[PDB]
Design brief:
Layout: E1 16-17, E2 24-25, H1 37-46, H2 53-56, H3 60-74, H4 94-97, H5 104-112, H6 119-137, H7 142-163, H8 165-173, E3 189-192, E4 200-208, E5 211-216, E6 222-226, E7 230-232, H9 245-266
Antiparallel strand pairs: 1-2, 3-4, 3-7, 4-5, 5-6
Bound molecules: zinc ion (3 copies).
Length: about 300
């Protein structure tokens, strides 16, 4: 049955009904057979023609395995009040206000039964936990603060699956040298300079608004770096004054383990001349002959269904 409280502001009043789901909205909270914004986002994300790069590389069963790790991060210590359904015997008026209850145990069971076709659908279902807490307990209750942090963890984990599902699973399991594991579409290796930090080796995971999502060898920290401050990996080092030599040496050692792993899996790794700029979705390091780019990639391909 249809909800009585607006999905945006969590208050009652004259509200519009979605044709596909039980959510309701004030016309003014959206600034104008109707399908709500949650249903529109999910439909686009689950259509093969408009699905994300992460969804193109995953089956529904594979996505269910990654959502189980996201549930573990959402179940932080102190989230006890949201780990099981609200006991109606202990709050006898709960169902007079909450028509669509949700909790972390129910969210975990729906993920296991392969109910979710995209990351957007898991976050949209998780959000009933916060919406219900605000209606019943109030916007300034101690439990509402806990529910807001649970939703922010869920948002972060969905964003991490979408950046690269293989990096996500490697970071979850933490095998020895997990950061040196190459992905099926290998991330280019760069020298990256962040303002105020020395030039350092990093993996380039994404390109957005003239920036590169860099993941640094050694500490495994991350930052958006300007594209003009990124060069393809080279033997000559762009020198920077550094506080501790041994930390730089460990990062370079870990970087050389990643390069040998790449050469075993794909059969090639091309270092570039000094100060060669990084370009979006660079293919230079995988070329069969770096002086003949028209010849293309070295990857032979054996029609492998390998993935899991
Ligand atoms: Zn509203
Ligand atoms: Zn809807
Ligand atoms: Zn990756």
């Amino acid at each position: 049955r249809n909800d009585f409280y607006c999905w945006v502001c969590h208050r009652e009043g004259q509200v519009l009904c979605c044709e596909l789901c039980p959510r309701v909205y004030h016309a003014k909270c959206l600034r104008l057979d109707w399908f709500c914004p949650e249903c529109e986002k999910i439909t686009v994300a689950e259509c093969i023609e408009t699905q994300s790069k992460a969804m193109t590389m995953l089956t529904i069963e594979q996505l269910s395995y990654l959502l189980k790790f996201a549930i573990q991060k959402m179940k932080q210590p102190g989230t006890d009040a949201f780990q099981k359904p609200v006991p109606l015997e202990q709050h006898p008026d709960y169902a007079e206000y909450i028509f669509h209850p949700m909790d972390l145990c129910t969210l975990e069971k729906r993920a296991k039964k392969k109910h979710y076709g995209c990351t957007e659908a898991f976050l949209a279902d998780a959000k009933w936990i916060l919406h219900n807490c605000i209606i019943y307990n109030g916007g300034n209750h101690k439990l509402t603060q806990i529910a807001k942090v649970v939703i922010k963890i869920c948002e972060h984990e969905m964003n991490e699956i979408e950046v690269c599902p293989e990096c996500y699973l490697a970071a979850c399991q933490k095998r020895d040298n997990w950061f040196c594991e190459p992905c099926s579409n290998p991330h280019p290796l760069v020298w990256a300079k962040l303002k105020g930090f020395p030039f350092w080796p990093a993996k380039a995971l994404r390109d957005k608004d003239g920036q590169v999502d860099a993941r640094f060898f050694g500490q495994h920290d991350r930052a958006w770096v300007p594209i003009n401050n990124c060069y393809l990996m080279s033997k000559e080092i762009p020198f920077s004054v550094k506080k501790t030599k041994s930390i730089f040496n460990s990062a370079m050692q870990e970087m050389e383990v990643y390069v040998e792993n790449i050469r075993r899996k794909f059969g090639v790794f091309n270092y570039s001349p000094f100060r060669t700029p990084y370009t979006p979705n660079s293919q230079y390091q995988m070329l069969l002959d770096p002086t003949n780019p028209s010849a293309g990639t070295a990857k032979i391909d054996k029609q492998e269904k390998v993935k899991l």
